[PDB]
Ligand binder design. Structure first.
Ligand SMILES: *[C@@H]1O[C@H](CO)[C@@H](O)[C@H](O)[C@H]1NC(C)=O
Ligand SMILES: *[C@@H]1O[C@H](CO)[C@@H](O)[C@H](O)[C@H]1NC(C)=O
Ligand SMILES: *[C@@H]1O[C@H](CO)[C@@H](O)[C@H](O)[C@H]1NC(C)=O
Ligand SMILES: *[C@@H]1O[C@H](CO)[C@@H](O)[C@H](O)[C@H]1NC(C)=O
Ligand SMILES: *[C@@H]1O[C@H](CO)[C@@H](O)[C@H](O)[C@H]1NC(C)=O
Ligand SMILES: *[C@@H]1O[C@H](CO)[C@@H](O)[C@H](O)[C@H]1NC(C)=O
Ligand SMILES: *[C@@H]1O[C@H](CO)[C@@H](O)[C@H](O)[C@H]1NC(C)=O
Ligand SMILES: *[C@@H]1O[C@H](CO)[C@@H](O)[C@H](O)[C@H]1NC(C)=O
Ligand SMILES: *[C@@H]1O[C@H](CO)[C@@H](O)[C@H](O)[C@H]1NC(C)=O
Ligand SMILES: *[C@@H]1O[C@H](CO)[C@@H](O)[C@H](O)[C@H]1NC(C)=O
Ligand SMILES: *[C@@H]1O[C@H](CO)[C@@H](O)[C@H](O)[C@H]1NC(C)=O
Ligand SMILES: *[C@@H]1O[C@H](CO)[C@@H](O)[C@H](O)[C@H]1NC(C)=O
Ligand SMILES: *[C@@H]1O[C@H](CO)[C@@H](O)[C@H](O)[C@H]1NC(C)=O
Ligand SMILES: *[C@@H]1O[C@H](CO)[C@@H](O)[C@H](O)[C@H]1NC(C)=O
Ligand SMILES: *[C@@H]1O[C@H](CO)[C@@H](O)[C@H](O)[C@H]1NC(C)=O
Ligand SMILES: *[C@@H]1O[C@H](CO)[C@@H](O)[C@H](O)[C@H]1NC(C)=O
Ligand SMILES: *[C@@H]1O[C@H](CO)[C@@H](O)[C@H](O)[C@H]1NC(C)=O
Ligand SMILES: *[C@@H]1O[C@H](CO)[C@@H](O)[C@H](O)[C@H]1NC(C)=O
Ligand SMILES: *[C@@H]1O[C@H](CO)[C@@H](O)[C@H](O)[C@H]1NC(C)=O
Ligand SMILES: *[C@@H]1O[C@H](CO)[C@@H](O)[C@H](O)[C@H]1NC(C)=O
Ligand SMILES: *[C@@H]1O[C@H](CO)[C@@H](O)[C@H](O)[C@H]1NC(C)=O
Ligand SMILES: *[C@@H]1O[C@H](CO)[C@@H](O)[C@H](O)[C@H]1NC(C)=O
Ligand SMILES: *[C@@H]1O[C@H](CO)[C@@H](O)[C@H](O)[C@H]1NC(C)=O
Ligand SMILES: *[C@@H]1O[C@H](CO)[C@@H](O)[C@H](O)[C@H]1NC(C)=O
Lengths: 451, 125, 112, 132, 132, 53
């Protein structure tokens, strides 16, 4: 009935696509003269106020387990960490034999944790040598066949780099923004499991502040829920998929290192220095972390109540400790002010639940030669820190796992897991999606072009 | 004000009045040293190709442009009455997506290529 | 300004032999729009001036298939193949690439 | 009648002339907007930034009614509250540099909804074509 | 009816055919002008250059009166390049590759009579006509 | 016994024995869309208006 093709430009149509995002950093702490391992000089300042646009009658489909933003964030974090350790001292001449002996002195019983080692080291002049001593943890030295012979644990895999002493490891919020022609969709559904149609879709200019916190078996300083404890998994039937838990209310954890350290500088070359622990003044005590018993019990009860819905109605829920493996996957590993902790989370996951001012002290261990990002051939030798360190944090999540069930029911045991850093950022980049705007369309009107 | 992509759930009759909002948002202005330098070039090239395609037709600098191609290839099987008042632009792309490569060639041969030839032979005299 | 040198000053040409002159400039005559501005003017006695060759090597109006010029930059030549009796007068080279417009010296051609 | 290159006012050569005389030399400043490890990225960044900045003016000319034109007139009225002046003292006694500092804080109103009246000319034109 | 696809000439297919045939395939060659750390900078620079060349060509085609047309015929008489070939032996007995060799250095004095006497004079009179 | 003066700060590179330190003139040009303005006044003193541009 006299209908002809009409071209419209600028129609609101979008399709799924993958692109590269950039920074947006707050200007409050952007101007300070403090260097961080996550660079800020290459990130543009953020907008003074975000622009939130609500979409009516729009129903999009999200999927938290197939998002490219997590992979891009992982690549950027790894690249930043690799770039932050370049311009300064490399500890190649430290692969020498050592004459180590027990520290003793004040031992509360840390019997063999610390060792007093002496060695020969080069000086600024090429033809002279100096004899110095340093204190090393038991997790860094390996005996080679009373003053016995020891050696560093990395002296047969790779000569590594010393951590730059001018940088800091404190996380800072990072915003990711899409380029022109691309939009970010935000799911505002409070009860969303990360996978499926979202009723409340809202166009957001960028993202919020996401702190790159590195931890295992627990989530520290994350995003809390709004209504109830949320359990999200890719396949709840499969036992080979990790389970992500989000806490409604955060519990408090305090960590400290009671020893008062003392850092001394040793010159190993022209313009190069090595930082060692000379003496410990005071008393020697173990590092520990504490969790309030009642708040943890209430949080675990809420987790059990919200976990009962998926599995059954009369099955018992049991919590056990880790199974085995490396030290980084069986302990709660984190960073407190520049010192790396490895805490024993065995008194936390120890309960059995039936359908019918105390604190929990967690012993921890400290290591100086670490190897993160699950790589082989690179270290990050953290220098000693003078004084006493303390940290107060929030526990706003869990990474649980399930064992192979027997008799198909009547028991379900959950133990903590971890190891992969993508699960840390999947818990925060779950409400976001990237789309590509297509502005060209055709529709039938009754125009005929003048001839 | 509805803002960018404000009329995404609105009908076709109310979404065609805000084409200017989405028209201007398609062109705005070592880690993070080559990311932008490769994103902006792609953003420029995606816009230039669309502006060349819209213009090898007879529609050069107009946001709404209606031509003289009959409604034969694109089988909507639906009348204008329940299209501009009972459907949104997102649902339209789901129906006509197979016929958007045999309608982009009827706008380049049956229109503004033949049409540009009798005009060249009529200003001759 | 830019000076123009014309060599020679007096060129006796036989009626029916090839002839050639030259003109040189102190600076490059290339202009910003990618053109070289050279004009060859024939100044017959008691007659209006005539433009023989414009833009170095392009034939102007008239010039009945006889006069031709060539040159790249700062060195230009004019060639006459079949000299007749009417080709008696003065020849000048003028620039146009930069103010002021400066003419050439001159080249008197007479029948020998 | 063949052309002399000496009669050519160069780049910005009419910057001291009046507004009525500097308006015939727009092509000279129009053509110059598009000409041509470390120390190999900053030049590329400058070139990319120069390309995407010229396009933002051509898109702004895409709306309104001035596409592919240097001198284009519209039908937007001018009130006396912008510059109460005659036509014999703007185009004959004023420079383009002196005009861009008088009408400088009144340009966002002109550049906006007042001149984007083409939306009232594209829906007023397709309705006429849909009537035979 | 028709059910074959071998009749499609393709990109640069009509490069040996005459002028009257090569003028109906302009859209095919109009598409391919815009197609889509060491090595990374090399490829990125090539993309920027391609865009700049296209933008310069589209600016030249539009400083004249021909803004968005592939076949655009103007108001300049034919004396700029005095090729004595008439209309019959050009559009039927020659190709574009021989025409480009024929008018190769008489091409800068044609590009100057299209932006000075063709469009610049026309839009000045059109502006003055509505001014009255 | 003596030592070099830099042995407690850095160990620095020798100068290449083929390069030279003779300066050569360098001209600076402007990109597209920009311009360079030159003051042709003869008694110019830095700060202040220039009537010959
Ligand atoms: C380590 O041994 C050195 C002697 O080599 C001694 O001076 C120092 O006090 C010892 N440090 C501790 C903590 O016992
Ligand atoms: C350091 O070298 C000396 C010889 O110069 C040796 O007597 C001493 O035992 C060495 N110290 C060690 C291996 O700790
Ligand atoms: C998430 O919720 C949706 C309901 O919209 C449901 O279809 C889906 O199975 C849920 N995912 C899991 C892993 O249970
Ligand atoms: C989820 O796990 C079950 C049980 O192992 C398996 O059969 C199924 O293929 C998995 N994937 C799904 C449901 O997408
Ligand atoms: C640790 O030792 C330093 C001196 O090195 C002292 O100033 C500080 O007060 C000590 N800290 C405690 C808690 O005793
Ligand atoms: C951690 O320390 C704060 C004081 O800074 C205290 O209020 C809180 O109870 C402590 N947490 C635990 C679990 O003891
Ligand atoms: C479990 O049983 C309770 C009643 O005891 C009921 O309210 C609840 O819906 C049941 N949950 C199921 C069947 O998943
Ligand atoms: C877990 O607890 C058992 C005691 O039942 C203990 O033997 C084992 O070493 C513990 N594993 C870890 C990783 O703490
Ligand atoms: C943690 O504690 C358990 C028992 O409390 C102990 O068997 C284990 O060796 C400790 N360390 C690790 C790394 O599991
Ligand atoms: C769990 O708690 C009980 C009661 O205190 C204790 O006997 C048991 O050893 C604990 N389990 C582990 C693995 O330490
Ligand atoms: C506290 O934790 C114990 C596990 O040792 C559990 O049996 C008890 O039910 C918990 N209390 C409450 C009120 O849930
Ligand atoms: C921990 O959570 C509380 C809210 O319960 C909040 O006030 C506090 O700032 C959080 N601490 C952080 C984010 O370090
Ligand atoms: C959204 O859907 C409701 C339910 O049909 C409808 O009443 C409303 O008009 C829709 N919104 C818009 C903007 O049309
Ligand atoms: C017009 O519609 C008929 C119906 O099938 C189809 O065969 C024909 O190809 C269409 N015309 C064009 C140019 O696509
Ligand atoms: C026009 O479309 C309507 C659907 O709204 C349909 O009922 C009617 O039959 C159509 N008319 C023709 C002539 O196809
Ligand atoms: C268009 O082609 C695709 C791919 O073969 C097909 O899936 C789709 O159904 C076609 N469109 C229609 C309307 O059948
Ligand atoms: C400068 O002003 C005078 C006024 O007498 C005018 O004649 C001259 O043309 C102006 N300069 C330029 C470059 O237009
Ligand atoms: C004319 O338009 C300007 C636009 O800024 C406005 O300020 C002024 O009041 C207007 N005068 C009228 C409407 O009389
Ligand atoms: C404009 O000129 C007229 C006479 O031509 C005069 O009456 C009027 O005052 C002038 N306007 C101004 C603002 O001077
Ligand atoms: C235009 O308004 C701005 C407002 O900040 C002011 O600074 C400026 O002086 C005004 N222009 C004139 C010519 O007064
Ligand atoms: C090639 O040349 C032959 C003879 O000159 C001619 O018949 C033929 O048409 C030409 N090819 C094309 C594609 O025109
Ligand atoms: C006009 O044609 C004549 C004859 O060839 C030529 O000499 C002259 O240069 C042409 N005009 C222009 C402006 O090129
Ligand atoms: C073109 O027309 C005829 C046909 O070839 C030819 O004789 C004539 O000389 C040509 N015209 C001119 C002006 O040369
Ligand atoms: C090219 O330019 C030269 C002068 O440099 C001239 O002699 C020749 O005729 C020109 N070629 C054409 C095809 O115009």
């Amino acid at each position: 009935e006299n209908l002809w093709v009409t071209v419209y430009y600028g129609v609101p149509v979008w399709k799924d696509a993958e692109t590269t995002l950039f920074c947006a950093s707050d200007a409050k702490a952007y101007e300070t003269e403090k260097h961080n391992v996550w660079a800020t000089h290459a990130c543009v300042p953020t907008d003074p106020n975000p622009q939130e646009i609500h979409l009516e009658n729009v129903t999009e489909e999200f999927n938290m387990w197939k998002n490219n933003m997590v992979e891009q964030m992982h690549t950027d974090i790894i690249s930043l960490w690799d770039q932050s350790l370049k311009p300064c001292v490399k500890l190649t001449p430290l692969c020498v034999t050592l004459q180590c002996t027990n520290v003793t002195n004040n031992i509360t019983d840390m019997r063999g944790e610390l060792k007093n080692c002496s060695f020969n080291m080069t000086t600024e002049l090429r033809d002279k040598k100096q004899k110095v001593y340093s204190l090393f943890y038991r997790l860094d030295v390996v005996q080679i066949n009373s003053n016995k012979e020891y050696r560093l644990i990395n002296c047969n895999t790779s000569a590594c780099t010393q951590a730059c002493p001018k940088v800091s490891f404190e996380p800072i919020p990072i915003h990711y923004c899409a380029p022109a022609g691309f939009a970010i969709l935000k799911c505002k559904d409070k009860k969303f499991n990360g996978t499926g149609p979202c009723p409340s879709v809202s166009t957001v200019q960028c993202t919020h502040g996401i702190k790159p916190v590195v931890s295992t078996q627990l989530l520290l300083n994350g995003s809390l829920a709004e209504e109830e404890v949320m359990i999200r998994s890719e396949n709840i039937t499969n036992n080979a998929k990790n389970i992500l838990v989000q806490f409604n209310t955060p519990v408090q954890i305090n960590c400290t290192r009671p020893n008062n350290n003392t850092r001394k500088s040793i010159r190993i070359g022209p313009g190069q220095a090595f930082y060692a622990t000379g003496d410990i003044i005071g008393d020697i005590r173990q590092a520990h972390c504490n969790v309030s018993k009642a708040t943890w019990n209430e949080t675990l009860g809420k987790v059990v109540k919200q976990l009962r819905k998926h599995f059954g109605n009369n099955t018992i829920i049991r919590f056990a400790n880790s199974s085995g493996g490396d030290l980084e996957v069986t302990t709660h590993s984190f960073n407190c002010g520049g010192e790396f902790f490895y805490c024993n989370t065995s008194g936390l996951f120890n309960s059995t639940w039936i359908s019918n001012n105390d604190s929990i002290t967690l012993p921890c261990r400290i290591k100086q030669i670490i190897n993160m990002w699950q790589r082989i051939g690179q270290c990050m030798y953290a220098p000693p820190i003078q004084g006493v360190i303390r940290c107060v944090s929030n526990i706003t999540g869990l990474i649980l796992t399930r064992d192979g069930g027997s008799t198909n029911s009547t028991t379900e045991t959950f133990r903590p897991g971890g190891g992969d850093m993508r699960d840390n950022w999947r818990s925060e980049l779950y409400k976001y999606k990237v789309v590509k705007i297509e502005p060209l369309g055709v529709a039938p009107t009754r125009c005929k072009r003048r001839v | 004000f509805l803002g960018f992509l404000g009329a995404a759930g609105s009908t076709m009759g109310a979404a065609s009045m805000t084409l200017t909002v989405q028209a201007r948002n398609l062109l705005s202005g070592t880690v993070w040293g080559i990311k932008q330098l490769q994103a902006r070039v792609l953003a420029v090239e995606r816009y230039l190709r669309d502006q060349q395609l819209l213009g090898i037709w007879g529609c050069s600098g107009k946001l709404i442009c209606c031509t003289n191609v009959p409604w034969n290839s694109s089988w909507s099987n639906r009348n204008l009455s329940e299209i501009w008042d009972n459907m949104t632009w997102l649902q339209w792309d789901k129906e006509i997506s197979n016929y958007t490569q045999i309608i982009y060639g009827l706008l380049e041969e049956s229109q503004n290529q033949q049409e540009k030839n009798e005009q060249d032979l009529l200003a001759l005299d | 300004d830019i000076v123009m040198t014309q060599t020679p000053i007096s060129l006796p040409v036989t009626p029916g032999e090839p002839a050639s002159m030259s003109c040189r400039s102190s600076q490059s005559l290339l202009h910003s729009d990618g053109r070289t501005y050279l004009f060859w003017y024939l100044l017959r006695p008691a007659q209006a001036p005539q433009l023989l060759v414009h833009d170095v090597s392009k034939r102007a109006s008239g010039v009945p298939e006889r006069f031709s010029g060539s040159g790249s930059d700062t060195d230009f030549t004019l060639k006459i193949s079949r000299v007749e009796a009417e080709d008696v007068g003065s020849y000048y080279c003028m620039q146009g690439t930069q103010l002021p417009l400066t003419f050439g010296g001159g080249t008197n051609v007479e029948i020998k």
